[PDB]
A paper describes a structure:
Invertebrates possess a different gap junction protein family, termed innexins, that is essential for eating and developmental functions in Caenorhabditis elegans and for electrical synapses in Drosophila7. We recently revealed that the C. elegans innexin-6 (INX-6) gap junction channel structure is a 16-subunit oligomer, that is, a hexadecamer, with larger dimensions than those of connexins. Here we report the atomic resolution structures of INX-6 determined by cryo-EM in combination with GraDeR.
The density map of the INX-6 gap junction channel was reconstructed at 3.6 Å resolution from 35,608 particles with D8 symmetry. The extracellular docking surface of a hemichannel provides cavities to accommodate the E2 β-hairpins from the opposing hemichannel, which is reminiscent of a model previously proposed for connexin24. The inner and outer lobes of E1 straddle the E2 β-hairpin stacks whereby the E2 β-hairpins serve as a wall to prevent from leakage of permeates to the extracellular space. The narrowest constrictions are provided by the N-termini making a funnel configuration with an 18-Å diameter, and others are given by E1Hs.
Numbering used by the authors:
A (entry chain F): 7 to 51, 54 to 146
B (entry chain F), D (entry chain G), E (entry chain K): 245 to 292
C (entry chain G): 7 to 51, 54 to 98
F (entry chain L): 50 to 51, 54 to 98
């Protein structure tokens, strides 16, 4: 599909008021990691496709697809046969699906924390800047 | 391109097999990881 | 699908008037739990998929899927057979 | 990955069997429960 | 006309059921058994 | 009796496997168990 949301971008991307140099990189960071975090778990809305032999009735294909996607997967360069047991087959093991899409959500969250820290702490000081900034400003 | 592993259960127990899957995502993830890596470690050095 | 509702967020998220520190965590709380509460029962609109053997005509598959989803389910690490009765299985 | 249980009814009575189901949700729920747990118990300690 | 009994084996064990069968032979066997019975017991009494 | 032995195979075999698994059963060994013991495992209690 095709969809684009501007107001969600403009909202945090601008509306919180400060120009503070290169601290806005915390902002633009949170944007990038947030978006890519989402668009990846979007499943390009065909996560992974698999080969199954020919007698499966296609309601198994729509199974073995998932089952492959959850239970682990792995790799071998090709032509080694598989050997046997678990050793030489599963040595080279790649599943990060359990990680990427969510660990990015966590990422963006941890880039947006430090601001919240700041506003909280500077509020502890009892003397607010923001009021002053707007006041002297306008 | 990977070789997926798979199970059933019948009176014979583990009953397992392999089916090789194409993998689309891995073209994304290792398209971006480069970029995202530069851009982070940048954000570090400029933020220190 | 893909859908995003801002005004529902902004409404309670802001409009009730107070800045009260860290009591607004009651607000942001209600947001998170509300959203995730919904998006989970969204069924990712494939709740659960099952394996059924091959002679079911696919109007049973669309049954056994649900029936599995309502009547209980369980787990075993795999290779124990099932034993028998209800004990070691369930 | 679970083993679902299932019934029919024929003149032979309970007539039951098992079919192993893949389970997608459980990847969500135990992706978030961690996070949601930190965040709640936080909200407690800051709210006491 | 009979009700036959039948089994399978899956992870659920006995897994049994019934299917009612027509029975042709039984029309023979109890067509002849009469006759054959007369004729035997005859052969006895004439042979004693 | 010109059906030496008949077997049960599950349902996705296309019937040119049935005419196989029939023979293959008939040559490679067979065995028995009274019924309901599961099969246990390995070769011991099964065979």
């Amino acid at each position: 599909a095709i969809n684009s949301v501007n107001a969600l971008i403009s909202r945090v991307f601008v509306q919180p008021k400060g120009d503070l140099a290169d601290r806005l990189n915390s902002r633009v960071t949170v944007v990038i990691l947030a978006v890519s975090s989402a668009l990846l778990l979007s499943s390009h809305f065909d996560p992974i496709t698999c080969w199954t032999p020919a007698q499966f009735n296609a309601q198994w294909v729509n199974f073995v697809n998932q089952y492959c996607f959850v239970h682990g997967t792995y790799f071998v360069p090709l032509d080694q046969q598989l050997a046997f047991e678990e050793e030489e087959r599963t040595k080279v093991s790649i599943q990060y699906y359990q990680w990427v899409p969510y660990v990015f959500a966590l990422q963006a969250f941890l880039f947006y924390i430090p601001r919240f820290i700041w506003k909280a702490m500077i509020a502890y000081s009892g003397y607010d800047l923001a009021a002053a900034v707007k006041y002297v400003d306008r | 391109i990977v070789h997926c592993d798979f199970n059933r259960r019948r009176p014979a127990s583990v009953q397992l097999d392999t089916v090789l899957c194409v993998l689309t995502l891995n073209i994304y993830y290792e398209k971006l990881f480069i970029f995202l890596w530069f851009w982070l470690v940048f954000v570090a050095v400029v933020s220190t």
